[PDB]
From Swiss-Prot, chains A, B:
NCBIfam families: arom_pren_DMATS (TIGR03429)
Residue ranges crossing the lipid bilayer per the database entry: none
Pathway where it operates: Mycotoxin biosynthesis
Keywords: Aminopeptidase, Hydrolase, Prenyltransferase, Protease, Transferase, Virulence
Organism name: Aspergillus fumigatus (strain ATCC MYA-4609 / CBS 101355 / FGSC A1100 / Af293)
Catalytic activities: brevianamide F + dimethylallyl diphosphate = tryprostatin B + diphosphate; an N-terminal L-tryptophanyl-L-alpha-aminoacyl-[peptide] + H2O = an N-terminal L-alpha-aminoacyl-[peptide] + L-tryptophan
Superkingdom in the source lineage: Eukaryota
Taxonomic placement: Eukaryota, Fungi, Dikarya, Ascomycota, Pezizomycotina
GO BP field: proteolysis; verruculogen biosynthetic process
Function: Brevianamide F prenyltransferase; part of the gene cluster that mediates the biosynthesis of fumitremorgins, indole alkaloids that carry not only intriguing chemical structures, but also interesting biological and pharmacological activities. The biosynthesis of fumitremorgin-type alkaloids begins by condensation of the two amino acids L-tryptophan and L-proline to brevianamide F, catalyzed by the non-ribosomal peptide synthetase ftmA.
Protein name: Tryprostatin B synthase ftmPT1
Record carries keyword Lipid metabolism: no
Site (Required for regioselectivity) location in chain: 113
Matches recorded under PANTHER family: INDOLE PRENYLTRANSFERASE TDIB-RELATED, PRENYLTRANSFERASE ASQH2-RELATED
Amino acid sequence: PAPPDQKPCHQLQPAPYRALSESILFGSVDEERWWHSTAPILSRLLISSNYDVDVQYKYLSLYRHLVLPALGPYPQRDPETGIIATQWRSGMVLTGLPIEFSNNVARALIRIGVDPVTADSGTAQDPFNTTRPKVYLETAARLLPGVDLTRFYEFETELVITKAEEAVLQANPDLFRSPWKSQILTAMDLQKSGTVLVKAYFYPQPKSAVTGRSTEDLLVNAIRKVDREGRFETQLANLQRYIERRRRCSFFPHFLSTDLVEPGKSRVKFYASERHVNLQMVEDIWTFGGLRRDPDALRGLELLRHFWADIQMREGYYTMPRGFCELGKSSGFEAPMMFHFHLDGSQSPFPDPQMYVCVFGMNSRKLVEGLTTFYRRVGWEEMASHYQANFLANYPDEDFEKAAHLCAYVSFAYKNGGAYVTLYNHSFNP
Amino acid sequence: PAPPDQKPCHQLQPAPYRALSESILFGSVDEERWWHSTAPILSRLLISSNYDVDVQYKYLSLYRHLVLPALGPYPQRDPETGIIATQWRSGMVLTGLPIEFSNNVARALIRIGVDPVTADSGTAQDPFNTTRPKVYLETAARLLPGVDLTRFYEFETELVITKAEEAVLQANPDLFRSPWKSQILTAMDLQKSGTVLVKAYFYPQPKSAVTGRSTEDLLVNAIRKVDREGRFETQLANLQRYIERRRRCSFFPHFLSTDLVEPGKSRVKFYASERHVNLQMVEDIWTFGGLRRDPDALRGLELLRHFWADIQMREGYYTMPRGFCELGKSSGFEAPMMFHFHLDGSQSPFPDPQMYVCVFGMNSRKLVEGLTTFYRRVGWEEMASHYQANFLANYPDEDFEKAAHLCAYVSFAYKNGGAYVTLYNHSFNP
Ligand SMILES: [Cl-]
Ligand SMILES: [Cl-]
Ligand SMILES: [Cl-]
Ligand SMILES: [Cl-]
Ligand SMILES: [Cl-]
Ligand SMILES: [Cl-]
Ligand SMILES: [Cl-]
Ligand SMILES: [Cl-]
């Protein structure tokens, strides 16, 4: 596993962002303000991760053309409270913003997470944001080669509410009281070659409310129905058997995601949240109750233990987040830990697990110091030396003694004898 | 005078053009087809002229955002004749296309000439294209720093028809029978630093038709009225005295152009067409009847003589162009020679002349061979070696035994002890 690139880039206006900024005519004030609040962070991420210049420009232009209009209204500041939020509170970030850039610091790859929204999203005209995500994926599909939507349609049919089911949730608003209303989210994985890999995420909590089927049964029946070839059947069965063991409760099946490629090559990730945030519970999940203890499983768990200590995670029993914690809102915010399970079409009996720890509310500078300690432990030299100062460079006017919102989640997997660490960070500067 | 850069670039899809092409969503089919027919030529021009990568992207993006929508309907092919034209026939090129990229091969600088048009331009809704150029310059002005429109307004008021005068030309179409209907044209000079210098050109032949004032009196009264400080007064007077000498006819005042900067720093170029295309007439104009024979004037004229022979220009008496010669139309096309006079605000008694020879209808490959001979004569080594193959690389599928439309005009001046040569070339690939 070749160590990740990390070049320094602290510049407040990186050259590609300026070059485009001085050339773009925006047909919307919102698109213009979004750009100036996020494009500098994207541009820095791209040059620090050592993407080629041509590819930097491809992606900043794509950001401009495809993403900006899908971000909807620019966030607004409350005069007296100072809190800055958008009317639709996205399930993608705890700040509720519809945009997030994530940094795979094991490979130096950037991903753009987008909750496609309109001015009507959240309001009476569209209270569950049904159509705009689809339109976004459809547009991405015609623009971007290799983007195959067959998996999205199959899951949309099973996992997203129909127009009648909406009416039931409008007529009777007591049946779905959660403010987390996002059904679909998107992600574009930006490869070094210029190719974009698109993923869709499905959150069927509203379909659950209207049909009386639990989130688990929806996810599993969905996956099981779409899986014609039965490539996921073994891993899925054993994940179910594990969720069964756990129910006989703190483990909660939450959502899934799928890639958008040829069906017989497609791969799904099943997400579950866990509220006992402690290292004995991580082992239980990581090893499926001690059933999955091959060398690779245990070697990864030893390293997971090192990671957990290095970033200084606190143990605890943490309940699902009450509302949101938007910019201006104060965080020491505590939330649940999370796992995805990778249904990969291999012959492995168990799908590969990936841990997501919510670090939102932990001092972000401190957290990144702990990560640096971890980068050194695994010999990621360039990243050890340069990442922290690139991290802080994205939040120029911010106070890092108080700031605990800059990193929201960190994920850990073990792939090819190596740690895989991804930071999900604050992607917005007013 | 430091010799011009010229790097080779023969690639059919240069990297910046691909990078943008794979990222742009076009809200118009016309903008999309325009882009694919012209952006490769612009991208090649920019890398051969050795512009920085960031600046290449600034300008290709600007092309995309500001220019593409101003090009109006994509040109259409006639099934039986094969001729390819746009409904509005632009006065900017003999092909009638609203776009032209010109190459200053003395400095390696590119300029974008644009005739801003809509789907309505030329038709009953807008037969003289009055508003769209203004809108373009106004948009460029808010986008681009340093663009000052005070000069444009002053000349627009004097030189472009009012809405009543239009009505007179519609009601009575016999009063203006010329198909050259463009009143305003634009040019963006792309500097190496990233700064864009915008010029406006004014063609008052229609205002002439409705007011009964000759083109000359319009141009001179216009310049004279706008010139508060009297910076142009001496050069203008002597140019008039010369036009007077010539009338007492083949010399014809045609149009002017102005830069768009601070007024007291502004500079105008007065254009006139000459139909005795021969070297004795060039001397007469160049030296204002033998009144302007300082060493710089005569040293430039010696070099002009070399240029004229090297590109193998044919002498002759040539009358103004009857209609257009569009793509698919056959050229050995003969047209008038042309001169501009640079009213520069200096203390010189005479404004600097610049010759424009119409080479449209001369074999373009042959012409560029003759230019290469000229580049060598003046020691422009890189340009001598690489320009021809960069020229031909812009017209990939074309036959260069017949092709005489690829270069339309070539201009010659003498600035700072050195030749200044600019090619005005075909900027479109179907
Ligand atoms: Cl590079
Ligand atoms: Cl429906
Ligand atoms: Cl149902
Ligand atoms: Cl803390
Ligand atoms: Cl460069
Ligand atoms: Cl008017
Ligand atoms: Cl008048
Ligand atoms: Cl010839």
